[PDB]
């Protein structure tokens, strides 16, 4: 029951949790969605009927009935959060606000050629939440073209005022555009001593770090594990920051872990989605309900289906003697976390999966199935698609990868002498070519996007996008794959897979059942040595030492997520010599601008 629609001139009476300041009601709704308690909100827009102090007031509310009394008021905009909704959600707001000054701690001031450039700085910076930028037209001269960066405890501005000839906007780290490097490397037996800006109780360091990530002020963190000596401090997740933006010192200690915010790589990593169960762990919180459940799995589904429930502990029928109906405790707290974490009273705890819809769908797990080297099989590579040509007669043309609901990502060289999209057929989730028949269902390609600069495969820009006529219902058979995040350029991928039907040209011949081969990456420079006749750009990556087709995916698995590191472009020829691929990372800005 998503009421996505905002409510004009309406105020929701009472139930306030807190008050923040947002540029729009529309952003208020996002803030409400992402706060652990908020079901609904009331925004106060700029207007005579209200004093300047209360404009941009965004009031986060909760109700046990899940709603509140509506009273009309001028300038009041009110909504419900998206927790209640099936549709995916994003925290990424690209709005520039004209004549708006969003106040905060101003930690840096400089000259910028424009709002956009000011914003790329806000985004590329470790501390930046939102920026304000003074235009030329700005009367006071030495202030002209100053782009000043700010941060707050909450990530939202302490106040908002109208100041003409100025533009404010938010960091785009959550639009997946930041060039800031993510440090995924986690330090066991380590602690950090710097400003502690908040603290939660976490079941492990993974959740700790996830929590660090979506917390606006948290740059790095320390976790005091269950095995920590001081009892009071166990499972305590400490969220830290510093003026440099780095840990002042690495102190050595046992049973504590440290790490960093992943805010940059936010889109390729599970963040709000905690799918593990925690056994003989009980999560202390406020009790919402207690119900009969057959298992901790249905326990969780009850949690997820209960909108106020943030977490649960399931208590199983006792010690295998008892009838198998357990007790499901639906819990909540003030942040979305446990107040206390207790080990050894034999409950099974986890979180609400209602959160997961905030994650990018390319982060969801893939059922284990069977790992057979010889052949691929159902659901194994949900992103890979086969790209078919009608002319002369219908046959496999290329490989492609689903990077979107509406999008395939593939090679440009695949479209050589293709006169229109109208001849293209994209099939999804196909194991066998034999499997395709006249009745087989497929996606029509609405549009082919080839790189402005593309000329030839061995020239660099071999990449293309397909926009589909019709969006994909994701299924264990057909899913997206994540694009490498720019913050990850230094990641070392040790597990990589070329998939496809084996078409690098009509000769060679083709393949029926989808083929899969794990392949080592090879360094550019080492690659440059095997290819003398040709150059190898920073926009190309190699591998080998090759069952894939043209436009086919190079899928690297990192931290339990699949990334599309490269697209098969020209490798001449199975030999030894590695395939040369396009470097997807290097095209991120490009893909994003094209897909939005």
């Amino acid at each position: 029951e998503c009421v996505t629609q905002l409510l004009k001139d309406t105020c929701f009476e009472g139930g306030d949790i807190t008050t923040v300041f947002t540029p729009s009601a529309k952003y208020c709704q996002v803030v409400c969605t992402y706060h652990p308690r908020c079901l609904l909100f009331t925004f106060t827009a700029e207007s005579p009927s209200e004093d300047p102090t209360r404009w941009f007031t965004c009031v986060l509310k909760d109700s046990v009935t899940e709603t509140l009394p509506r009273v009309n008021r001028t300038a009041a905009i009110s909504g419900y959060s998206f927790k209640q909704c099936s549709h995916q959600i994003s925290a990424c707001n690209k709005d520039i606000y004209v004549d708006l000054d969003m106040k905060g701690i101003n930690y840096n001031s400089s000259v910028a050629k424009s709002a956009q450039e000011c914003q790329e700085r806000c985004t590329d910076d470790v501390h930046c939440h939102f920026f304000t930028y003074a235009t030329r037209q700005f009367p006071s001269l030495e202030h002209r073209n100053i782009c000043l960066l700010k941060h707050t405890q909450t990530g939202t501005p302490t106040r908002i005022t109208k100041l003409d000839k100025v533009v404010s906007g938010f960091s785009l780290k959550s639009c997946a555009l930041s060039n800031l490097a993510c440090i995924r490397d986690i330090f066991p037996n380590t602690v950090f001593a710097d400003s502690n800006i908040d603290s939660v109780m976490a079941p492990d360091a993974f959740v700790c770090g996830r929590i660090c990530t979506h917390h606006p002020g948290c740059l790095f963190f320390t976790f005091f594990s269950q095995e920590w000596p001081k009892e009071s401090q166990r499972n305590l997740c400490l969220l830290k920051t510093s003026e440099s933006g780095l840990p002042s010192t690495r102190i050595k200690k046992s049973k504590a872990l440290s790490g960093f915010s992943l805010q940059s790589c936010r889109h390729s990593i599970p963040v709000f989605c905690h799918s593990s169960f925690y056994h003989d762990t009980d999560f202390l919180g406020e009790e919402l309900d207690i119900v009969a459940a057959k298992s901790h799995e249905a326990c969780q589904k009850l949690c997820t289906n209960a909108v106020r429930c943030q977490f649960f502990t399931y208590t199983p029928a006792q010690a295998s003697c008892n009838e198998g109906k357990g007790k499901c405790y639906l819990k909540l707290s003030s942040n979305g976390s446990p107040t206390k974490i207790l080990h050894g009273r034999g409950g099974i705890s986890g979180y609400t999966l209602r959160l997961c819809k905030m994650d990018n769908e390319c982060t969801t797990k893939i059922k284990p199935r069977i790992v057979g080297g010889t052949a691929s099989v159902r659901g194994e590579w949900p992103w890979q698609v086969t790209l078919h040509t009608t002319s002369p007669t219908q046959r496999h043309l290329c490989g492609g990868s689903i990077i979107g609901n509406q999008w395939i990502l593939t090679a440009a060289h695949c479209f050589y002498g293709v006169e229109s999209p109208k001849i293209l057929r994209v099939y999804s989730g196909i194991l066998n070519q034999s499997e395709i028949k006249e009745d087989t269902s497929f996606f029509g390609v609405q549009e082919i996007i080839i790189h402005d600069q593309y000329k030839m495969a061995e020239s660099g820009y071999d990449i293309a996008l397909l926009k589909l006529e019709t969006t994909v219902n994701y299924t264990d058979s057909q899913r997206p794959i994540c694009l490498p995040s720019k913050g990850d350029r230094n990641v070392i991928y040790t597990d990589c897979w070329v998939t496809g039907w084996g078409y690098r040209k009509l000769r060679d011949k083709i393949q029926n059942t989808l083929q899969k081969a794990k392949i080592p990456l090879v360094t550019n420079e080492e690659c440059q040595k095997r290819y003398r006749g040709h150059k190898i750009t920073h926009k190309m990556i190699c591998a080998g030492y090759c069952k894939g087709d043209s436009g086919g995916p190079l899928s690297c698995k990192h931290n339990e997520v699949w990334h599309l590191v490269g697209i098969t472009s020209w490798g001449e020829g199975c030999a030894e010599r590695p395939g040369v691929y396009t470097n997807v990372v290097e095209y991120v800005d490009w893909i994003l601008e094209k897909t939005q």
């Binding site: 000054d101 101003n106 202030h143 003026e243």
Partner: peptide, 8 residues
């Protein structure tokens, strides 16, 4: 950090 707010 000294940084000053834009004049009204």
């Amino acid at each position: 950090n000294p940084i000053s707010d834009f004049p009204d």
